[model samples]
Target chain A: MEVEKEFITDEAKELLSKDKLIQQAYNEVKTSICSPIWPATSKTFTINNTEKNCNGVVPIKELCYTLLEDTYNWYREKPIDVYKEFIENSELKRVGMEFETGNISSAHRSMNKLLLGLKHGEIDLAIILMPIKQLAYYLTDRVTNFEELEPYFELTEGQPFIFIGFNAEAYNSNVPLIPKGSDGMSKRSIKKWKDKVENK
Target chain B: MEVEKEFITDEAKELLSKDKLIQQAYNEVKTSICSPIWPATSKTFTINNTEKNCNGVVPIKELCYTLLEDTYNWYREKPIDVYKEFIENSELKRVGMEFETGNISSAHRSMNKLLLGLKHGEIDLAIILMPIKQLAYYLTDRVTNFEELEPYFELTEGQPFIFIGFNAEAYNSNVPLIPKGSDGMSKRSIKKWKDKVENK
Candidate 1:
């Protein structure tokens, strides 16, 4: 049998790193959503090589994970940090989960739910969705300084939207998690680090 | 230029669709978590005609509308009711959504915000996350079916996985939005409908 090493576009290869980070991000998303809702999750799948399989993640995680997973592993033996390049350069996939609501009007409202998260800093959760193990490797592979990703969320009115969640309520405004530094340590960084450990 | 149309394996073709959907889904996912959430959405293009450069939709509405818009034209020339057929079939592309959170602890907790709507009689809203148009279409395209998809959702700890949405939680006690009755409505069905539309 012949081993076929077919040609791959740079674009396809770049997907590896992006996807790895995205996958990490997705796991973080899942961990975030499930952990808060399901307490048992803290102990579940904590061990390494837990023989886990996920059918698929939610749209928000799905998108984030895709880039991480694709970027991190898209290329065999490619350094993981290569993904940051894509993040810094590539166009983002939009945020939205589609459902068939039979009724166009009803569906519009449901779609609004996603919009709600975007308008508020809720989607900021995506900033921390990258896989940690892969992230370490990703960071190792990258050459630039660590700069936190802040989803500059934007929204226009009357486009059929809805908001859901524990409102844009402030959790803690007093204390900052990450210490200031060129290491890109900010509140978002601290939250991301904490999330990575928990999800990992 | 010679436009060649060759038959492809069902798996290969479906994989292609899966790939396309996954890729596109990733885009939406990224937009949702990282970017500013749009306050509203609207119809960006018409059904059936690909000749025009329809930039398509934005955000959640964009995702649903795109599917709806595509499905409408899928069955325009079909001999059977495409919409109705979609209801009976199943596929994962339509059901799953990607998610990620910046905070591990909060990631999982916040995700449920959307799930809660789907679980508790929030029929209109719940359906938006995973639309019926894509569900039915995915089914018709042989993307996935109830039997094939059951184990994945793992909606709860011990119970069987969910197909369309979670049981008991949804407004409608009817499990699987596209009930077994074969109403010919589902996201999977739309997948099939769109496939046909593209081929023809």
Candidate 2:
């Protein structure tokens, strides 16, 4: 692949290299995307010599133990980082999850519906949490064109949009956990991720 | 800025060589980001050697004409391609425009408020349009760690999510464009993009 870099003056490089500057960029980017409200959903799988099976929603460290369980020497001895990258880049087939919210707006509607169903009284105050994992999947699979996104916002026929978990208010909320929508939607979406594990 | 491309196999090269394949990826990425319903909000400017004054929103092609009007020889004779790339890479400080939707949920809330304000009678078919250019600015400017995107479905998010245009289903509808929420939310978001435009 072709690579290129523009030359920078020493002063510019010094300025850019400062930790504060880098942190500032990270902070700005984080705030722009509403990063505080959500956390990454990581799932682990047990790897055998030839295949990886959905051992379940284990922690990253637990996956190391799973690797040690394999009879094959290669699996038993390889470092954990190798396994981690493999899972990330692997052609992860959706295994265990399916989605109820067919698209972005549907997800929003589901949240609003839940809130409204409870009562229009505290809709603004309501904390609607959808698993980030499933929501990302729906966006990846369902949206076919940039235009399809607009309908979700149209006032006459469109549904409302939902915020991704990366919100500051939601993230900072002292509440131990924001109650998730009760409609089995997140679990359904998880099915898509867990069931389709494939090493690419 | 620096960029590097991975070395690819002949087969991979062949696959990437296809215009259709490239277009497909672009289309997929565009649609996945909800590109169809809106157009890019573009502006024009009159250039001096040191700076430019915002001329207001105008056709992209017209910007080329203005560049041609410059007395400088470099501006007078450059091809359209030069102008295109220049505009794309230009540190285009957005002179105006703002977002009322501060965060994703607020944006979602704004959309919902509009629809619910009208009642759910025509809810099935509303259109929401946001400029792809501005949207791209938000994503590129905001998202901090790419991993934070994983929860939205491990399949996507956080990888510099750029905007694609809004779609026809939403765009073609007879409904009048929804009045942007009055809280100056998008404008607030716009500040991040414009103030930080120097890096690009």
Candidate 3:
């Protein structure tokens, strides 16, 4: 029996090229998964004045980079069980303890916890990263810290935005997670922090 | 400048067919947005045994159908603002009240409120539908009702799994809207009651 050959047209070839394929997949993940969970603000950080916005989260880009770095560093095509085992390892307890006592400010605190949790093996990287890769996206590059985030808490004083836990691990509880606009923390706070950081 | 005419291959033509195109877009939305939010269970209702899992939410299929039907009924092809205006109309307050007072069961009750809210102009079909279309997905034609759902509440005892308000409008604002699995009442419960009534 002879096997039939499929022909590839120049148009098809270009469309299916390595760059196009990767970029398409990359764009899909960014918008479909990342953007919805972690909404990006305009470069100026003009977030809408919404109630219930947590003031402590960091940029989605930073989180994305951290997630990618950790995934690459830890595994070489491990099994599902191995991944679970890694997240459940005894390592996170120590990191969790340090994080609890750390002098990190409130703004970077939740994210710092998540990042530290991801980096130091305090939390399940792959479990959260799987969803993070799919449900979070941020644009623009404005690095943030506690000094910058603290003022926003004061600026928007008493506004019920930004409610991340200090030792919050990830968003994979049995409870369904809803997207409260803004993948990158409080947009209003971002603008204030930029001015404070730049002017000072 | 000469314009190049692109050749269409059989594969491309098949892929670009109307049904194929719509279905692909539909599938994309389901996986990317809907699946992540609702996280469907087996048609047999084989939900995970997590502590707070509410056994009430319907599958994405039913909600998607409901959303499509409502959108078509209420509009012409309009701009974003027009759609917003339609939802912001003053009709929701009345329906919202009845929903609050109705003796609806839990699982189907939240959904009942949502469905009633949509039908009675209490909520924006688009806002809820967008989430419903993504988060919900289930199979089985079991219509439900208050009495049926009340039993599940009894079965589960005093667990805080199903806590949707009778008048729950939508899921936004600063308050964190935790997913209580499903609304207790279902159209399926209605069917079961109907069959018994007919048999008697």
Candidate 4:
């Protein structure tokens, strides 16, 4: 996958080195997206007179999270951060993060959440991940993309943060298709892709 | 319509007086919703074998805006406040306002918009209008209500703003129904209801 950054100023760049947790999250997502995933135009389609389920780019979003559950404590559905208690006693100043594959509205909500955490002095820095515009079409309609959210980063009032937008390296036949109705983070689904990634 | 407010602390309280524009907007919306508008459970219902256009609470939401649009200059669709340069020549200190009835996502979007306006030092204060939960059932599914956005207001780090949540006074036959498929702000729609408010 290709990537873009916003709000990563000269000083903000240090978040990667100052906080290894942010670095781990950045590398984990950056490395996990090995092959571009394509989205289907509709729910089901016919190819060679065979009926196959068509998938959107949602599974790829879930795939990005396959490895991060070990540190990312918040549920995707309800992203109220609960990392404070453990952080209180620890030496490490870990970061708060959100991986949004939902609506553009949700992307705003996530940014505000991270901003709140940054203001409260718990989260050392923040990282927000979503798809870029070209990647939005393959996903569900109205999904949050880099283009829609980039300008608003300044509204955050100089908070130390990074927004990571993932895009396709290529949209050709070599890229994988997200399987329809596949819960990508589930054991079976993750197992299928994890093995695929490891062997490569 | 009934109202519930969030983040209106003592410091925030001065907005009602200091920014008379905010006070005017507050009073304008407060005075407008004279009667409750009920939502139909399903789209088009047969009552006494007549298919009256089954209405939602959206019209009431539109009704609140029937007056202040002279100053509350923003479209409901794009909601990007363009009141800046035009605001320069005037001696008055005006405001940024958003009236939302689309989806819960849009409610979040509007709040962020108002917050951005305040942070930029252009808008004197901001106002956000939406439904309460009971009001949501009468509007559309998953429409933003006071409950969902209340706790998150603190996340904004005490920005001086008012979130206005409108609700029904009663749910009975006396209250009017929002006309089905009604674009409430259209000239015909507003004209129809404007006379209704004026005569009463």
Model 3 clash count equals 44
Model 3 DockQ vs. reference = 0.01
- Model 1 lDDT tens row, B91-168: 322322321101222222222433443233221111112223222232223122222222222222121112232111
| Candidate 1 chain B lDDT trough over 10 residues, lowest sum | B76-85
Native interface contact recovery, all models: 0.00, 0.12, 0.00, 0.50
Superpose all Cα atoms of candidate 2 onto the true structure and report the RMSD in Å to 1 decimal: 24.2
Candidate 1 displacement at residue B133 in angstroms: 24
Instruction: Summarize candidate 2's per-residue lDDT along A1-200 as a digit string, tens digits.
Output: 00011122343235335634332332332222222121223122111112122112212112222222231111222211111111223332110101122345554544444333223221111112222332222222432222333333232111112222311222222222222233322543333322221111
Candidate 1 TM-score on chain B: 0.20
State TM-scores per candidate: 0.18, 0.18, 0.17, 0.73
Candidate 3 on A1-200: residue-level lDDT in tens? 01111222243234335434323323322322132221221222222222323222334323333333233222212212112122222332111111111112322333333333334333322111221111112111222322323322221111112211121222322322222324534545444433332342
DockQ result, candidate 4: 0.43
Every model's DockQ: 0.02, 0.06, 0.01, 0.43
Q: What is the lDDT of residue A31 in candidate 1?
A: 33
Instruction: Enumerate residue pairs that collide in model 4.
Output: B55-B178
Error of 2 at A100 (Å): 15
Candidate 3 wrong stretches, greater than 4 Å? A1-72, A75-200, B1-198
Which stretches of candidate 1 lie above 4 Å from their native place? A1-178, A181-200, B1-111, B124-152, B155-200
